[PDB]
């Protein structure tokens, strides 16, 4: 059994946010197992959505567009159109392909996320669109049996690392030096692999397994 | 300088959920400050909304309506019309009054709930209806300076307790006996006080300021 992590990049803020892409990775929650950054990145996939066709169906927030215009061209690499794009319907199918293929348990597995009240509300709204497409009215939607985890198995990464590390507003975990090696800046799959590694070390630290690094000894990409 | 906690009871499960009542308690996050159940309960408020007035504005989901049909007539007594009912605008003003009078810092305080992806999305939407009332359009809604806490200072209770106790899927914490004396089942404010109590003790337990019993208030369970 695996847990998974999701990340959206969005052009809006509500649950009806227009979505740029989606990254998901299925990691092994065992505190003894420590998977490396390389095969965490290799194991995950990024789903890229076509912006132009979400017009009139999902929402683009002026607040968020202003934000993206103040982002380096490396960051704005994500949003630029592509031949790899998919419809939100096609994107959610690729997402369920990934979930079923990576030993995710409908009842026991947990879905991690940094911003739990941001990501999953978009995930669920994309899922109910398969049913809206089916003609199901908005009061008769029911996705209980269609979600990658049970709503009480959703989990928030900031809460977890703060609790694991017992420092108020401590939402990133220092790592050992050079595990950051290979990291590239504005990659969604690199974000998820950092956050999984930070959670594992946090968990390994809190139990008595490993030594928290010295500021000389920790990868600079980890401290924020 | 406090934190706070919120709890919604709803007739639906998206951010347009019709809202039955809202419960908020401000609370001291210092682990050396252990506050009594009776003390928290009287510090909270419950805002109760008019369901009829939300019809055609908020969402009444059939599965949630069925679920309230299977609940006891004591729990179901929550959803009956009252003379203490407020429109959803009125309620959010009452929400903002309480946050403004209880030592909440807009930048450093933390906001808590069970199912962070259920309670906060509803609350922010009710905030956005302040902006929708001011004539703002959807692509221009922006509630950053209105929200009781910055979105990154939000916190999930199930993640907290489970990560304080270091036990998978353990999201309630055992309490020393007599703590929850006065607890009542279908009560929003009591649920919030219990959650504030189980998080503070879990932190006490995780910090080793106090040893967790095997002989608890029978209510933690």
Swiss-Prot record, chain A:
The EC number(s) this enzyme carries: 3.1.11.1
Catalytic activity: Exonucleolytic cleavage in the 3'- to 5'-direction to yield nucleoside 5'-phosphates
EC category: hydrolase
GO molecular function list: single-stranded DNA 3'-5' DNA exonuclease activity
Domain of life: Viruses
Record-linked Pfam families: Rv2179c-like
This protein's UniProt keywords: Exonuclease, Hydrolase, Nuclease
InterPro entries for this protein: RNaseH-like_sf, Rv2179c-like
SUPFAM superfamilies in the cross-refs: Ribonuclease H-like
Role noted for this protein: 3'-5' exonuclease that preferentially uses ssDNA as substrate. Plays a role in group I intron homing. May play a role in the final step of host DNA degradation, by scavenging DNA into mononucleotides.
Protein name (Swiss-Prot/TrEMBL): Exodeoxyribonuclease
Biological source species: Enterobacteria phage T4 (Bacteriophage T4)
Underlying gene: dexA
